């Protein structure tokens, strides 16, 4: 979404799939990550897809 | 100071072990910083300078 208006520096919101209380029942989760810990994934420019 | 109010979110990642992330931030977003008194820093730096 971006904030874009200045006077602010913020923390990016990301999501991933997890090995839950059952091993083979992968479910959805979300987490806030500080920007340096996250990088763009691939030259295939899907901007929503990021890498730890 | 870190004026943001981060909240820790517990995630369960594999059998019998958990991962802790950051959930929603309470309140407004602010910048992290460190403060020093500049007259005392200037005097200290000049004292280094004469040495």
């Amino acid at each position, epitope marked *: 979404a971006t*904030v874009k*208006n200045g006077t602010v520096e913020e923390m990016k919101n990301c999501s991933f799939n997890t090995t839950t209380e059952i091993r083979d029942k992968e479910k959805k989760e979300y987490a806030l990550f500080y920007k340096p810990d996250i990088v763009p994934l691939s030259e295939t420019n899907n901007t929503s897809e990021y890498r730890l | 100071t870190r*004026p943001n109010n981060n909240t820790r979110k517990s995630v369960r990642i594999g059998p019998g072990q958990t991962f802790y992330a950051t959930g929603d931030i*309470i*309140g*407004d*977003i*602010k*910048q992290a910083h460190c403060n020093i008194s500049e007259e005392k820093w200037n005097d200290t730096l000049q004292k280094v300078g004469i040495e």
Partner: antibody
Amino acid sequence: QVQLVQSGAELKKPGASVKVSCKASGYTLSDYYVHWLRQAPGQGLEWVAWINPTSGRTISPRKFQGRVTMTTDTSMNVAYMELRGLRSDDTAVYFCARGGWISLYVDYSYYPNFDSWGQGTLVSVS
Amino acid sequence: QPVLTQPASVSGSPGQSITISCTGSSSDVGSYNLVSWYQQHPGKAPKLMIYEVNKWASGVSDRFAGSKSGNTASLTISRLQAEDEANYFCSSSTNSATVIFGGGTKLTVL
């Protein structure tokens, strides 16, 4: 000199929507957080939301989440607050008010130190 | 989420003292000392009379006390004159990052 002149009143059908605007005067809106408040006839003052007019970041307690959407146009120097899905309760006097100074290093968004208030505008329902 | 409370209506005596209080939870009134008091006349808008318990708002006469204790606070008004006939609201901020108002109480004649 300070004024927070709001727009006029306007009756709406229940379940309708209404845009309410709040005009700055004597100061630039980017200084302070804008708090939105209300007063129904015979009831007390009800706190609705704040907006950080620069980043447009907002918080509203529980009752108005989904109900209220927020914008500002600091070039025009005006603050807006929309309601959707109205009810009979919305027969009430909305007040716009400026809160604390916006500091980059200390969070003053969320505490009750309202300095000046709008005159008052009424959403109404039948 | 609004929870803050206070006696809905009381009366004073000229020249004497009165207690106008408000109460909440440790989450909102004790966790933060950030408390304030407001005066609104019908047909007009409010007017900041206290902020942060005992910082002096503009135009406030020394009658208007400001104190806090635990989950409580009050305008322990002293010398209690008559030219303030409208209500005296309370307010505080929750640790959930929201502002809360009281239900209002009238400084009745008096």
